[model samples]
Target chain A: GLTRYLPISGVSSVVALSPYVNKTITGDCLPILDMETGNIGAYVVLVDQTGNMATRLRAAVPGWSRRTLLPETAGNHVTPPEYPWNSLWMTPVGNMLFDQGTLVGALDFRSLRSRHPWS
Target chain B: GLTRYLPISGVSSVVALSPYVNKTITGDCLPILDMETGNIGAYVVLVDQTGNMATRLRAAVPGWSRRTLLPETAGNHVTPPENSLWMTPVGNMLFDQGTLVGALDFRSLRSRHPWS
Candidate 1:
C-alpha cells in the first residue's frame, strides 16, 4: 500500500479529444493551461489510455500505473520563466511545450477550449 | 490584458470523456490526481466546449470569458485541509468533491481517476 509519483516528462501531444475522449463522466478532471499565459495553474485526471477512467485511475491513483512515457528529464531545461509559464506546481519538468528548445507540442487536455464562454 | 480568474465552483461531473474528448493533438493538458493521495498537483487545458481550443483559449487567455459556473462562494465551506486534497493551487473552492459538507460530487476535471 504505497503509491505516489507522477514523473511525467516532455509529453508532446497525447491526442484524443475524439468526441470528448470517450464521454462517461464522474468527477472528471483536465486542465493545465499556460500556453504563453493562457494561465490555468493545473487540473489533471482524465484518464482513458484504454477505458474506465484508466481502470479507476489505476485503482485510486497508484501513479496511474505509469500509463506511458517515462525516461526522466530529457536534458532538464524547461523554459517559460524557468518553468514559470504561469505559476504553482512544477515537478520533473511537469508542464512541457517548449519552443526554441524543441518539443513544441504536448497537452491534449481534451481539445483544450476557453475563448471565454460562460454566462 | 489581465486574465486570471478560475472561480470554479462545485462542478459535479461536467460529463464528456466521449471518444477521447474530440481527439486533437498539440501541447495538450489534463490530470489533477489526488482521489485520496494518488498525488498529482495540476494540469488543465483540454478545451472543446465547442471547438478550436475554445477559440485559442479565448484569444490567449482573457479569463476564458468566464466559462459558466460563477456565484461567488455559495456559502464557502470547502474541506480537505481547507482545500488540501493534495496541495498547491486552490482557488474559490477549486477541487469540489466534498463527502459531508454537501456538494456530493463536482470535480469533472474529467472522469476524476483515483481509488486508492
Candidate 2:
C-alpha cells in the first residue's frame, strides 16, 4: 500500500562521463547515454538558498572501457594493482568537477516500477 | 560513460503488487511511497510478439512490513529464522496470481557504495 523512489544524493552528468552516485546503475534502467557513451539524461543540480548548480551522469558504466575517470584505478574508481574496474556496477562519486565534499545531485529512483500488463 | 534503465522481465502493475527480479531495491534512492506504501510511478508492460502487458511495483519493501505474498518469508520472500527482514531489503519471485507469467528483482544499486 506504499510506494516511493529512494533518494540518491550527489550525481552529475554535466561533467561529461559520470560515475554512479550513492548507488549502482543497471543494464535495464532508463536510457541516459549517447552512442559514444556520452551523457544524455536529466541533469543533477545543487539547490541551496544562494541558488543552484547542475551537472550530468555519464552514459557509460563507471567500471567499463569508456571511462575517463575511475573510482578504482583513479583510486576509488579503480581497484588495486590487480582487479581494476571489473564489476558490472559502478562506484558512486564525482571528484573532478566538485570538491570531494560537495554534493553532485540526487537520483530519480521512482522511475523503476510499472503496473502495465503484458499484451 | 552511458546508462539506461534495467530491462525488467514479466512485471505487472494491474496485478496488485510486484516482487524484485534479477535485482534488488534500496532506500535513499528516490521517494516512491504514500502512507501505507502504495505505488505511484511509471507502469511497466511486456512488448510481446502480439502486444503488451502492464503492471506496477508495490511501494512497500518486498521483504518487509508488507502483508502481501513473499518470496522469502512466505517462501523465497523469507529466509531462515534467527535472522530478520529489518535489515531493509526484499526477495525475488511472483506467484499466487496463477500460472505465474513472469518474475523479476531490481533495486537502485545506484544505492550506497562502501567507497562510493
Candidate 3:
C-alpha cells in the first residue's frame, strides 16, 4: 500500500486550534487514507510540552502504526506559521533527506519515527 | 510502496534553468529514487508548447511508466515563481483532492497523468 502526506491546510488548521499555537511544535506524519474517499494522504500528529495531538480525521495507513517527522523544524518552527510549513520542504532522495529550501540535514524516514513503539 | 512529491526547491530550480522561464508550465511528478543515495523523491517533468522536459537526475520509480500532474497550475503559474510554488499546495484526502492553500478542486493521483 502507498501512503500520502497530510495536506498542509489540514495540518495547519489542526495546529491552529490546538493549545500550543504560539509555541514551537514538532510534527510526525504517516501515509494515511481517509477511508471514505479511498485517496491516500498523511496522518499527522503534533507534539509539545503538553504531549501529542492528532488530527480528528478518520484515517489509516493500512498496517502501519508509526509516523515519521517531516524534516528540520522538528522542534523549531512555530505552529500555524504559513501555508507550507518549513518541515514539509523535505524531499526524500535515495534514502537520504534533501531540503527543499535553504536548510539542509540528514533524515531517514525509517529512523525518525515516533519516540515510542507503534501500537 | 509510497510516492514522494518533488521538493519545491528542486522543482523550482529545474524550472528556472529550463527554456520555459516566465511561461506557464505544467508539472508531472512520480516517486523517484536516486540510485546513488537510495532516497525516494520525485521525478518531475515540465510540459508546455515546446513539449515535455524532465529532471536529469538518474532516478526511477521501479515499474511506473507514467507521471502525474501536481494538482493545480497544470498550465497556470509562471515558472520559478518562489520557494514553494503555488501548485505544491495539495493534500490528498480520502478519494478527493484537497487544497493546502485557498485554491480547491478535485484531483486523483491515478487520473492526472501525462496528457496526450
Candidate 4:
C-alpha cells in the first residue's frame, strides 16, 4: 500500500513522497521510477534539510550500466539562511516535493536521454 | 568463494578486490570492510579509465547508517594521455587489478577510520 507515506505527484509513476519531516533523518528516501518505460529516472532529488539537498544518479546492478549521471548538491552553501517552507521535485514526472511546508526543487529526467548505451 | 576475482590488501578483513579489467568494464567491484571492526573502509577509489578515477564511499544497506564518507574523482581532464602499465589497489586486499599494465591509486580504507 502507498499509505503511511505521502505521494509526490498524482499517479505519475515517478516520485513516491514520504511523510513530512520537521528536522532531518537518515535514509529519508525519495525514489523516482518510470517502471513502465524503464527510463528509471535520471536525476533523483534528495533532501536532508532546507538547503541540504542534492541530485544524483549512480551506477547500479546488471553492471555494464555504469553511467554516473550528472549530480549537483545545492543547499546551505558553507552557510545558508534558514527557511520556513520548501518543496523539491522528483525526476521525469516533475512533481514538487514538499517538506516542512515549502517547495524544494525539481529533478528532471527528460535530459537523461542517454538511453541504454550498451544494455 | 572469494575467487573468480582477486584479493585487495590482505586478510585484515578489509578489502575484496576483483580481477584485472582492461579498457574498463562495468560491475567491477572493490569492497573494503573490517567485518571484524566494522570500520568498513573510509575512501574507496573507482577507476573508469586512466585518469577517469574517483574515490568514493557511499551509503549502503542497514539504512540508519547514512554517510557519503568522502569522495573525489581524479583522472584525465576531458582527455588523458594513454599509458601501457598500471595497477589499482583494491579495498580490503591488493589483488592483481592489473589493467593496461600500470599503477593507478590506492582506495585507503585504513583511513575510513572511526571504529564504530
Candidate 5:
C-alpha cells in the first residue's frame, strides 16, 4: 500500500516527475555566401538527448535565376555592371527563421510526413 | 633722326619703348559666403600702376525666391527647411576683359555698353 500511492499527512510533500518532462533542446542554422562566385548556401544542426552533436545539413541554392528574374544593362536608367543578382525571390522553408546577422533557426519537417494524398 | 626712327649698322639695335607699351595690370574677384547669416557675396580687387588698391566690391544677393521657386514640406518629393533662395536668378555683371571659370577667355562688355 505504501508503494502503490503515498499520501503525506503533514510535512511539505514533494513528488519526483517523470523523465520525459523538463527536457532542454537547442539547435542552429547558418547561411553562408561565397565571395568569389557570389554563391549562397545554408547549414543546419540538431541536438539529441545523449548530449551528442548531430549531422551538419547543407543546401547550395543558386544566387539568381535569369529566366524567372529580369536582367538589366546600361541604357535609359540602368548603369554598367549588368545582370545584378536579385536575392528576394529565393524559396522559403517553413518554420525556419533567419536573423539580420545570417543566423537561422532549426525547423521541424516531420509534420509534412503525409505522402501525396492527391496521387 | 635718333628719336624718330633709329637705323643701326652692326651696333646691336635696341630701342626703349613708350611707357604705355609695357604697362602691367592685375585684378581679382572672389565670392564669399557668410556662415552666420547664410548670405552670399563677392569682393573685387584691382591693382593699378600707382600700386594702390581701388576698392572692395561686394554683392549680397538673397537666396531662392518663394514666388518663382517652389517650397517643400515633408511629402510627395518635397521636404522641409522651406523658402530656399534661388541663386540662379540673380543679376550678373560683365567685365571689359576677364577670365571666367569654365568659360571662353577674353570677353568684352564695352561693345554693348550702352544697352547693357
Candidate 6:
C-alpha cells in the first residue's frame, strides 16, 4: 500500500503549524507513478543541500519509472546552507516497491519551502 | 644420374670443334652437386638477360645444395645482348635432383664470357 499527499503547498501549510519549524523551503517536489502496481507517489522537499534533490529522490524511489515531469521549485532566502538533514521522500515508497520492476512515469509538485524561525 | 664436366676450359675447347662453331663462347660455367644421390653437374653458359644466370640456374637445380663455390665470367665482348638463349647450366641437374629440401652451398665456375 502506497501513501499519497495532496500537494506540497497543502502539506507545507500543515507542517507550518508545527512547533519547531525553523527553515525556509528551498527546493521542489515531484510525483512518481509505479507502473506495476498503478500507484502514484510524491516527493516534496528542499533543494538547499545540492541542486540534486530530484536526483536523490529518484534514487530513493524503488520501481520509479525513468519518466520525469514538471519539476518545480520555490521560496528563496539567502540560499540555505548545505544541510545533511535533507530527506529523499521516495526512499520509503521505493523500499515497498523493491524488485517489482515497476515503471515510474512522472512527478508532480507545487514548490519547495523553508521553515523560517520567528525571533 | 648426374654427370660432371672438367671445368669451362676443358668443355669450351671441346665445344670449339663443333660442326658449326660460330659464336665465340661467352658467359660462365658452374658446378652443382646433389647431396641425396652424390652426383655432380655443371653449367657453362653466357649471362645476357638480367645478369642472373646463377639465379636462374639455382632455381632450375631441384635438389642442388645452396652451398656455392666459385662463380666466374669471361670473354672480352662488350656485354652480350640480352639474349633469350642464355642457358642456366643447372636446370637439367636440378630437374634430375627432383623436388628436394636440402642445403645449397656454392657454385664453382671459370668465368662468364661474351666472346668476340
lDDT of 2 by residue, A1-119 (tens): 01211223233112323334455322222343566768786533322111111112342344332432222211111221211211111122211111121222222213223211120
User: What interface RMSD does each of the candidate structures achieve?
Assistant: 14.6, 16.9, 11.7, 21.4, 40.9, 48.7
Cα TM-score of candidate 2: 0.17
Docking quality class, candidate 5 = incorrect
Q: Which candidate number has the best TM-score?
A: 1
Q: What is the lDDT of residue B33 in candidate 1?
A: 32
Question: Model 4, residue B23: displacement in angstroms?
Answer: 2.7
Residue-level lDDT of model 4, residues B1-116, one tens digit each, is 13222212211122334322344323224566665886754434443322211211122234322432222332312112221111112211111222011122232222221211
**Deviation from native of the Cα of residue A73 in model 6, angstroms:** 99
Q: Which stretches of candidate 6 lie over 4 Å from their true place?
A: A1-119, B1-50, B62-67, B72-116
Each model's DockQ score: 0.08, 0.01, 0.06, 0.01, 0.01, 0.00
* Worst 10-residue lDDT window, candidate 1 chain B: B1-10
lDDT of each: 0.28, 0.25, 0.31, 0.28, 0.21, 0.31
By the DockQ metric, which is better: model 3 or model 4? Answer: 3
- Arrange candidates by TM-score, descending: 1, 3, 2, 4, 6, 5
Error of 6 at B73 (Å): 5.7
Instruction: Report the error of model 5 at residue B30, Å.
Output: 13
Compute the lDDT of residue B92 as modeled in candidate 3. 21
Tell me how far the alpha carbon of residue A80 in candidate 6 is from the true structure, in angstroms, after superposition. Answer: 99
Off by over 4 Å in 5: A1-73, A76-119, B1-22, B26-105, B111-116
- Model 3 agreement with the true structure over B9-101: per-residue lDDT tens digits: 332222221122243434454455675997775454544322223332223343222434333234433221123221232322111122112
Model 4: native contacts recovered, as a fraction:
0.00
What are the per-residue Cα lDDT tens digits for candidate 6 across B1-116? 22322211111111211122356553445555565776665345544333334445556774432444433433322121121221222222111111111112112223333442
Span of 10 residues, lowest total lDDT, candidate 2 chain B: B46-55
How much DockQ does model 2 earn? 0.01
Q: Is the docking of candidate 3 incorrect, acceptable, medium or high quality?
A: incorrect
Tens digits of per-residue lDDT, candidate 5, B1-116, equal 01111112122121111112333333443345566876765332222212111111211223312221222221111111111121101112111111101111112111211112
C-alpha RMSD for every candidate: 15.9, 20.2, 16.4, 20.9, 34.4, 40.2
TM-score of chain A of each: 0.22, 0.17, 0.22, 0.19, 0.15, 0.20
User: Where does model 4 exceed 4 Å of error?
Assistant: A1-12, A18-119, B1-21, B24-73, B77-116
